[PDB]
């Protein structure tokens, strides 16, 4: 089949468009006709989308640039070993960050492949769920509500399609699609790929595949966009710049003191360059990137797709989770089970699912066809007034419409959908809360147009002037309204979604036939996750458009609505401006009868109170709320493609505890970054204080430049990036949600930093004095001082793994990367002491076993002090 342009296919009529593609409009192409056009045209992907460029990309990090400048200066001053050491440090930190980023991106790609784009395609006469990639031209694709168009289609059936094209055209207003050919962007019959179906149903024939799509260049350029830097990454780059600049000032003070007081200028320059490389947090942006990437991988292994990286930082700060009852807190497997007619009879509908199986029983007697008139008109309105179909036991439209269709097929009144010809349709909006169609009968065209309306009880009864009683139409009376409201509240209190139905001539003069109770069971595992998130201090709220009784009963069953809890309507939200809404909104647990405008108002009011809202709603109309929230969560398995396109994060298995896990890794990210910050800052302050005291008090320098560069490799390389790998605990399950502000340098953290630095400096200077008592500066002195500082740093790294828990509690072997890095640093120090060329380049000398034992015992004191402070603080908090 030759490829056809969309404009030509728009001018041309549908019949010939099917002919050129040899398309079967009803049965669809079988596998044989699919295979040939697949071989000719190819698969539907945009063909195929440099690793060395990504490796090079890391070097514009300003701290890495400062280290490169220091290495260049070392090269200029003929310092071979210094330049090699600095370059090795840069290469190892860059390699760590690059490997972590690559692994996270590959895992994210695998998870994205685990959720492929799909569509409803009829091929063998059976409507199946086929991937958008498998489409070949001429295939027949059925478009439902909240569907992303899989390929460029020519719609031969379109009753009330309304498709938004904001991503492609740039206009937010959806455009109606009509199946009539368009003679001579303006294609009102071609459904372009990449747009989303806001409303209505359709069936079309695909006219494009691969690069033949008319508007595929925007999606091509879309992949070439690069994700901007995360706000945490920006703030931690700023923090590293502050730390490097303060250390630069201190090092300049050291160098000026050395020059004015009198020392070797070249030696002071080498020490200054080595100290600048030391105290610059070259591993801080790298550890932030590693923590973010590792959190992405962990929540990928939790079956959650992270579309945007700055969400992982924000899930830790989340404190309120606002969800929808339909599709999020309930499995959305909707079913009509109770009918209350306008007369007063009660009908029980058995069976569950979007099928014809089950019967309507009235007073113990099965009712089919037109045995009971009022139930028959109820079922007829519920069948005709929809835009949903049930084909091959699969639903197309909204589940609440499919429940009515299944009820009609249960009663055998499905053929009444075809008997009525729709000429006027009032499109559903959640603000309206009702829908209506004006139809005429096929067999009796002489009969006047009759309008069917279904919706919320208040909106429907606002348009009803009459009602049915025993088969005759009477004027609607007030006690009839009272008993209808009482029965509606009675079904809603049992967890039934109540739909009111009216059939009559024109609008505003209809007959109220009664109500149907639609059972929507709650989603499994939501109650336990609500309990866990409440125990975590993360409040959970329900925002709905459904009635008070249904929302309250569902929330009571889940557990987010206690006996002493408040529920507020959308109209009360309208009556409350910013000041009252901001104070009432934490008290309310259930928001019912709220339009998406009211949902967005609730999100804005909760965000105004310093809260991080994580909206987990579904629905083709609830997407401005998902984009407006700080975090937008959707359901991968059972969710509209509109939400999954709008969501920031997608749950693959549709599990509410996964949001809790995302919050826990969000907290663990900041915990690990605090660990790195405290370790690096303590050892950097220790080294800076040692050199400052040596220059001020005229002692020989305890450390030389190559020793300071090895101390850099320890303090910013693998021994310190291992602390960003440190696993999450269970305390973050009970920990109060972190403030959205960074506040990285806690006063307690700074106090423990200064404590660790003070013990390290004092012990190292004590060893220096112990071997300097003889007044001869033998390089055994320098090697004892160097080993003392390195072992002090190793014990400081052991201490810095967890701020609160004791080292025995978390486990010495819990962090394998930390153990490997500690062993590597110990081996490197042993080589520096015991390998004669390394001894020559580091100006060291061999040591005795007893001297090493003394150094180990002395350096254990910083770990002992840290453990004592940890135990004291833990006992004080209890």
């Amino acid at each position: 089949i030759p490829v056809l342009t969309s404009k030509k296919a728009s001018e041309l009529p549908v019949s010939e468009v099917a002919s050129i593609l040899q398309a079967d409009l009803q049965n669809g192409l079988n596998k044989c006709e699919v295979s040939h056009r697949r071989a000719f045209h190819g698969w539907n992907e945009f063909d195929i989308s440099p690793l060395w460029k990504k490796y090079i990309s890391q070097f514009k990090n300003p701290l890495i640039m400062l280290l490169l400048a220091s290495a260049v200066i070392s090269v200029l001053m003929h310092q071979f070993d210094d330049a090699v050491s600095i370059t090795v440090a840069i290469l190892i930190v860059v390699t760590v960050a690059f490997v972590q980023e690559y692994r996270s991106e590959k895992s994210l790609e695998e998870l994205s492949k685990l959720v492929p784009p799909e569509c409803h395609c009829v091929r063998e006469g059976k409507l199946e769920h086929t991937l958008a990639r498998d489409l070949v031209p001429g295939d027949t694709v059925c478009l439902s509500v909240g569907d992303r168009v899989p390929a460029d289609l020519r719609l031969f059936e379109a009753v009330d399609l309304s498709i938004d094209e904001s991503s492609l055209t740039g206009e937010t207003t959806p455009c109606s699609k009509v199946t009539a050919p368009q003679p001579a962007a303006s294609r009102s019959n071609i459904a372009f790929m990449g747009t989303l179906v806001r409303c209505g149903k359709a069936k079309g024939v695909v006219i494009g595949t691969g690069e033949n799509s008319e508007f595929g260049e925007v999606f091509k350029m879309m992949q070439a966009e690069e994700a901007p830097k995360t706000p945490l990454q920006k703030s931690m780059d700023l923090l590293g710049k502050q730390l490097s600049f303060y250390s630069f000032g201190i090092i300049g003070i050291i160098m000026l003191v050395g020059w004015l007081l009198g020392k070797d200028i070249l030696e002071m320059f080498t020490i200054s360059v080595s100290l600048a490389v030391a105290a610059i947090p070259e591993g801080l942006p790298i550890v932030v990137t590693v923590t973010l990437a590792l959190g992405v991988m962990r929540m990928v292994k939790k079956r959650a797709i992270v579309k945007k990286l700055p969400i992982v930082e924000t899930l830790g700060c989340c404190n309120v989770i606002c969800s929808d009852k339909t599709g999020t807190l309930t499995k959305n497997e909707m079913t009509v089970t109770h009918i209350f007619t306008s007369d007063g009879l009660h009908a029980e509908v058995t069976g569950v699912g979007y099928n014809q199986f089950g019967e309507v029983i009235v007073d113990g007697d099965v009712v089919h066809g037109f045995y009971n008139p009022a139930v028959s008109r109820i079922v007829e309105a519920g069948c005709v007034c929809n835009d949903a179909v049930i084909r091959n036991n699969t639903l197309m439209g909204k589940p609440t419409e499919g429940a009515l269709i299944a009820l009609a097929m249960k009663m055998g009144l499905d053929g009444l959908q075809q008997d009525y010809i729709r000429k006027a349709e009032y499109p559903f909006s959640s603000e309206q809360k009702w829908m209506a169609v004006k139809c005429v009968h096929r067999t009796q065209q002489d009969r006047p147009e009759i309008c069917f309306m279904k919706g919320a009880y208040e909106q429907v009864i606002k348009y009803c002037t009459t009602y049915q009683s025993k088969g005759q139409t009477l004027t609607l009376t007030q006690q009839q309204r009272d008993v209808y409201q009482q029965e509606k509240a009675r079904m809603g209190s049992a967890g039934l979604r109540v739909l009111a139905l009216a059939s009559g001539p024109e609008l505003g003069q209809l007959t109220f036939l009664g109500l149907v109770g639609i059972i929507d069971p709650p989603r499994t595992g939501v109650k336990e996750a609500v309990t866990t998130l409440i125990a975590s201090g993360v409040s959970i709220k329900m925002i709905t458009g459904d009635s008070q009784e249904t929302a309250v009963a569902i929330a009571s069953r889940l557990g987010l609505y206690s006996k002493t809890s408040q529920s507020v309507s959308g109209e009360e939200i309208d009556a409350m401006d910013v000041q009252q809404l901001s104070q009432i909104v934490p008290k309310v647990a259930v928001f019912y009868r709220a339009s998406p405008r009211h949902k967005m108002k609730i999100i804005k009011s909760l965000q105004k109170n310093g809260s991080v809202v994580a909206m987990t709603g579904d629905g083709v109309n609830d997407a401005v709320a998902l984009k407006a929230a700080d975090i937008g969560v959707a359901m991968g398995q059972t969710g509209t493609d509109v939400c999954k396109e709008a969501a920031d994060m997608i749950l693959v298995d549709d599990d509410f505890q996964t949001i809790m896990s995302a919050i826990e890794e969000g907290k663990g990210i900041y915990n690990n970054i605090k660990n790195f910050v405290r370790f690096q800052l303590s050892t950097s302050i220790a080294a800076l204080t040692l050199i400052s005291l040596a220059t001020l008090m005229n002692f020989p320098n305890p450390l030389n430049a190559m020793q300071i560069l090895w101390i850099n490799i320890i303090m910013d390389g693998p021994p310190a990036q291992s602390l960003g790998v440190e696993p999450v605990d269970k305390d973050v399950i009970r920990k109060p949600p972190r403030n959205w502000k960074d506040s990285i340098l806690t006063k307690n953290l700074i106090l423990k930093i200064l404590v660790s630095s003070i013990i390290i400096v004092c012990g190292t200077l004590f060893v220096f004095w112990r071997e300097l008592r003889d007044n001869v500066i033998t390089p055994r002195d320098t090697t004892m001082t160097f080993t003392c500082f390195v072992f002090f740093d190793m014990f400081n790294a052991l201490s810095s793994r967890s701020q609160t828990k004791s080292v025995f509690e978390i486990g010495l072997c819990s962090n394998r990367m930390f153990c490997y890095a500690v062993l590597g640093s110990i081996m490197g120090q042993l080589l520096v002491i015991y390998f004669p060329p390394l001894q020559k380049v580091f100006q060291t000398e061999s040591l005795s076993i007893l001297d090493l034992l003394f150094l180990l015992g002395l350096t254990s004191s910083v770990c002992i002090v840290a453990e004592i402070i940890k135990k004291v603080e833990r006992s004080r908090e209890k």
Partner: nanobody
Amino acid sequence: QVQLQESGGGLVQAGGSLRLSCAASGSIFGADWMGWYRQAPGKEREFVAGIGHGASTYYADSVKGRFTISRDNAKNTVYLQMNSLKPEDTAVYYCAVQYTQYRSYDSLLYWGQGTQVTVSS
């Protein structure tokens, strides 16, 4: 409350004969509807076989003519016999019972834990 326990599921070859039974703790007399439902990955829950109030037997379109369903109040267990089963219609099987209902609106829909049946080529 009557509890439902499923048994009889297991590994079978294509074209063989299989048995299935959901037993009830109480007497199944007033139940106006009782059926079975396949749950399989990538698809929704589908009706298999059931009976209703007027002793009328309901079979799914893709299942009709192969599955035989019976009940007995003496052994209070609903039983299913499958013949000529194919590898492509295997899933996990759930038993559902509904009761008649008046002043409340709560659904008396009782499900079993389910027994998993795997059929290969």
